[PDB]
Amino acid sequence: ARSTNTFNYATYHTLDEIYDFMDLLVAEHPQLVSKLQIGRSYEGRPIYVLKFSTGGSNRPAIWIDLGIHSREWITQATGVWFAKKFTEDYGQDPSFTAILDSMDIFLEIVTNPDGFAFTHSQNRLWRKTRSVTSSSLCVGVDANRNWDAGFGKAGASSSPCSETYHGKYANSEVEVKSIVDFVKDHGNFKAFLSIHSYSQLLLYPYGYTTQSIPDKTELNQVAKSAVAALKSLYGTSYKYGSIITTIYQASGGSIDWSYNQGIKYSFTFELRDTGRYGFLLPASQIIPTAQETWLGVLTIMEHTVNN
Numbered sequence: 001a002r003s004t005n006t007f008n009y010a011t012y013h014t015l016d017e018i019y020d021f022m023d024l025l026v027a028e029h030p031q032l033v034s035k036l037q038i039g040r041s042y043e044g045r046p047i048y049v050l051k052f053s054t055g056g057s058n059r060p061a062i063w064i065d066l067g068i069h070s071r072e073w074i075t076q077a078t079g080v081w082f083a084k085k086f087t088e089d090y091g092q093d094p095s096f097t098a099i100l101d102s103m104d105i106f107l108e109i110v111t112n113p114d115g116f117a118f119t120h121s122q123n124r125l126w127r128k129t130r131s132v133t134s135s136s137l138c139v140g141v142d143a144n145r146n147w148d149a150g151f152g153k154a155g156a157s158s159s160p161c162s163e164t165y166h167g168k169y170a171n172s173e174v175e176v177k178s179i180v181d182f183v184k185d186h187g188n189f190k191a192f193l194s195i196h197s198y199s200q201l202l203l204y205p206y207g208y209t210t211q212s213i214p215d216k217t218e219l220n221q222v223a224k225s226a227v228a229a230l231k232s233l234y235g236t237s238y239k240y241g242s243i244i245t246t247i248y249q250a251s252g253g254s255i256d257w258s259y260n261q262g263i264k265y266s267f268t269f270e271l272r273d274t275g276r277y278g279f280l281l282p283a284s285q286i287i288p289t290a291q292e293t294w295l296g297v298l299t300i301m302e303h304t305v306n307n
């Protein structure tokens with residue numbers, strides 16, 4: 001509400017409330033966080049990233065995006081909690097302090113703002129963007145099938161009405177191209193984390209091909225360590241592995257694209273639960289989910305600073 005200390009982190013919020021939160025956080029911690037506009041959505045809403053930094057010039061960086069699939073409301077709620085947590089733990093947690101003293105963090109809480117507004121207004125289960133194509137009355141693209149990584153291959157649909165429609169061409173969705181351009185221009189991202197729900201999975205590349213990545217041994221051990229840290233708070237059990245061996249072939253996904261740009265520490269989290277509530281996770285689970293997920297993310301960031 002009036003301060004980030006009176007904001008209710010244990011309930012779900014609207015787009016306007018999350019955008020107001022971002023401005024409160026910047027006003028309270030102007031030496032540590034800044035708000036960047038990296039584009040505008042199809043319906044003209046600003047696309048914002050929060051940059052957390054203690055200085056430097058183009059320091060090596062960590063990317064985290066949440067909410068690319070709009071109905072996965074636990075992810076935007078986790079992103080708000082993360083933003084606050086960064087500002088609380090800098091100078092208090094020795095390990096997070098060391099990360100931010102050497103690296104920058106870029107956090108995109110609402111990666112698909114038009115879908116998110118639609119889930120509040122019209123259809124709680126909407127997952128796609130809201131772009132319109134002329135050959136159909138169906139709306140929207142699955143923005144996690146629109147990236148230039150095996151685009152249009154098996155594990156995505158070419159039908160505009162499908163929930164897994166990949167779009168007309170790679171990077172057709174402005175929500176995806178805004179990220180692509182920003183990461184390419186920056187050139188010094190070391191980790192790329194995309195957060196989803198549900199199923200309790202920690203995945204590494206690839207989804208579009210059976211080929212094993214050259215860094216499989218290391219990314220598998222980092223994933224094991226991150227799942228063990230996450231489980232330590234409440235006992236939540238995650239599985240881990242490559243996308244294609246753990247779930248199924250899926251093309252056009254963001255961490256396949258980021259790994260092929262040379263961003264070695266590329267992971268997707270699928271948060272709680274395993275299906276009892278699914279996308280309609282009760283608000284009473286927001287803070288426990290965020291707290292345990294933070295331990296998993298911090299484990300990946302520690303490995304990145306030292307490697």
Ligand SMILES: [Zn+2]
Pocket residue numbers: 069072196197
């Ligand atoms: Zn998702």
